[PDB]
Ligand binder design. Structure first.
Ligand SMILES: NC(=O)c1ccc[n+]([C@@H]2O[C@H](COP(=O)([O-])OP(=O)(O)OC[C@H]3O[C@@H](n4cnc5c(N)ncnc54)[C@H](O)[C@@H]3O)[C@@H](O)[C@H]2O)c1
Ligand SMILES: NC(=O)c1ccc[n+]([C@@H]2O[C@H](COP(=O)([O-])OP(=O)(O)OC[C@H]3O[C@@H](n4cnc5c(N)ncnc54)[C@H](O)[C@@H]3O)[C@@H](O)[C@H]2O)c1
Lengths: 363, 377
């Protein structure tokens, strides 16, 4: 049967959902709630058959949908999960971060415990082809992952609808908003929960000259995070939002006693100027310990997927797995509520550590 | 001044003739590099191990051997001294030299191992009438030198400095001395003093805080020395905060033998990024794999996005003389000029050596306790 989606919030990333759903056989967007006119026009040009609703209540009351995507601003997510839970529980793909406000953790945990349908948190990085390749090969190459290092070097946060992503109260803070992906990757690779975070971070460069109602953006733009895991593995994140010139936006290194594996992940092709030549191809580098003979493999993305989004086709691959769960051919929520909450708790811990200059314990 | 006692805390609340003392692997590197200097020679060696005395004699056949520090100082015709003894020996030997025959000294890293020696060694250095140069040579490796010269201009000001060392396990040493923290000072002191010093040099500021995670995860766990298992760390991460707000990160892995580049160093600021790619010793590159990796620097300007890569090759003659990309030779050129009086600058001071050791001790304490460690100076 066809899978019919409803979308709550349809700006840049909700438009990337619309384009990638459109590439799936047997899926369609039937319903959209998007309160911004310009975005309503942009969504209506992408998905002309989709009906618009004036509210979440109106969409849930009348739409014929099998599942929902939340792509509203970060601070909206927890209230919209609670509203859907009280109104019409459906399989839900909630954009990261799962939530922004620590005060919401108890009530959302209780909501998720009682929610009779899947909750999938849309941390799609594991499906970027170079990252997926590293995940599939890391155990065999490393002989067990002792250390995992992740580096994000990119350009400053884009301008958003109502400028929402310029303030911590709206985003959850930069380690929550941008780095939840990397924290979740640490748990996926190491297959253990974190026990401690140590961080250093600041707002060194970005948005310091910007004013909104007389207020200065307060979001971090760089830092380092060390994460200790139950039983002894360790990981490190490096973030810089003013490193626009880096050839690869993400690099991920996994090391163990038999070898090392590294992924090189390009940024969005739309931000690679044509005057710079062809964008970088994604790579994986395998460096076995005993031979010292390195292997480099190109892991290109299907051009149709590069056309549909900014995340190396990962949004499409995420939807294929989500649709399989909605259809019932799969039982698996690959990125659960609990994975989303761990990744948020790790970013909150990093922000608290960076603010206090002290280690932060997690339980 | 710093105050830390009970509940009181100021921070952290919410011809030139050379004598050689020690002539194993690194003292033999000093012999080969001194021999490349015009108007320098090794006149005197104290090396207590017969097999190393034979190896040292084959390299520097005109050098005279002495049975102790006291014997060398009593009768050797020398203008300066190199200390390349095991780490735990350095403090006692500096004190001995200061009491007997102070001369210009090139003291191998780490400057010391035991925090109980800091006060007495600082007293010795304050009263010492000749230069003390701590032999942290990495700044002279051609790719690192290029990064140090260009980083301010490329970055528009260094906000972040990331250093990574991926290499093979600690080599076997005379009497197995480098297998035990009491002998080495711990791995962040023995191996990573170089990187902590490069952070102070690049950022031109002192550290205020260290956060670290480290362990002995893999290496030497199956070795036994008359019942003792080695206790040295083999991997970790260190975050260092600086006066003025710059931050740095060190990543160490002593079981990443396969990494093409043994050291990589990245500096990032609002105008761009610079990265150095530093090969390990050519003698450990398998000849079946072809030519060893060429040192490189990569310039990534923020607004242009026009990336440039430069090859920075080391003179073959210097690669034949040592394991450190010719840096031992460059160090010796500068030290020799200071001994001759053509220069007055000690580029790597006692204080620089002590800072790098204190940063490694803080990292080890932070990793052992799971807590941030404050530093004052
Ligand atoms: N997974 C990823 O890689 C990725 C990438 C970018 C953004 N995101 C996430 O997507 C979400 C949206 O980010 P974006 O870049 O699309 O921002 P955006 O500003 O481009 O789009 C947000 C949209 O939400 C609408 N909106 C505002 N309040 C709403 C409400 N109460 N209910 C419904 N819609 C509402 C706005 O009108 C706007 O069109 C955020 O949670 C963000 O973190 C995820
Ligand atoms: N890049 C560098 O700067 C670099 C690299 C390697 C080693 N080092 C330093 O060089 C020193 C020696 O390391 P190595 O690799 O040559 O070790 P090694 O074991 O190869 O050589 C040390 C030598 O010291 C001799 N020795 C022991 N006790 C002594 C004493 N009391 N007085 C004099 N000599 C004594 C031993 O017999 C041995 O030959 C250490 O401080 C080490 O950290 C520095």
């Amino acid at each position: 049967q066809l899978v019919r989606y409803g979308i709550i919030g349809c700006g840049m990333m909700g438009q990337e959902h619309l384009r990638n759903i459109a590439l799936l056989d047997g899926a369609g967007v039937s319903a959209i709630f998007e309160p911004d006119a310009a975005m309503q026009r942009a969504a209506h040009a992408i998905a002309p058959q989709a009906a618009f609703y004036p509210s979440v209540q109106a969409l849930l009351a009348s739409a014929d949908i099998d599942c929902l995507v939340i792509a509203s601003p970060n601070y909206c997510h927890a209230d919209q999960i609670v509203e859907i839970a009280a109104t019409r529980p459906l399989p839900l793909l909630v954009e990261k971060p799962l939530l922004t406000d620590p005060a919401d953790i108890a009530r959302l945990t209780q909501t998720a415990e009682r929610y009779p349908a899947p909750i999938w948190v849309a941390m799609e990085y594991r499906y970027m082809p170079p990252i997926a390749a590293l995940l599939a090969r890391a155990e065999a190459v490393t002989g067990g992952i002792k250390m995992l290092s992740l580096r994000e070097h990119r350009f400053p946060f884009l301008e958003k609808v109502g400028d929402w992503n310029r303030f911590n109260v709206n985003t959850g803070g930069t380690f929550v908003e941008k780095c939840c992906h990397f924290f979740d990757l640490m748990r996926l690779v190491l297959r253990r929960n974190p026990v401690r975070v140590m961080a250093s971070a600041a707002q060194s460069v970005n948005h310091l000259d910007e004013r909104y109602d007389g207020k200065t953006p307060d979001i971090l733009d760089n830092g380092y995070v060390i994460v200790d895991f139950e039983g002894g593995a360790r990981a490190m994140l490096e973030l810089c939002m003013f490193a626009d010139g880096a050839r690869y936006q993400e690099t991920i290194s996994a090391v163990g006693p038999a070898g090392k594996i590294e992924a090189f992940v390009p940024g969005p092709t739309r931000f690679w100027p044509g005057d710079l030549g062809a964008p970088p191809v994604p790579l994986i580098e395998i460096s076995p310990r005993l031979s010292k003979q390195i292997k480099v493999h190109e892991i290109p993305v299907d051009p149709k997927l590069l056309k549909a989004g900014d995340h190396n086709g990962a949004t499409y691959f995420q939807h294929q797995r989500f649709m399989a769960l909605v259809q019932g051919s799969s039982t698996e929520t690959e990125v659960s509520f609990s994975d989303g909450l761990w990744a948020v708790r790790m970013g909150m811990a990093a922000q608290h550590s960076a603010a206090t200059g002290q280690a932060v314990t997690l339980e």
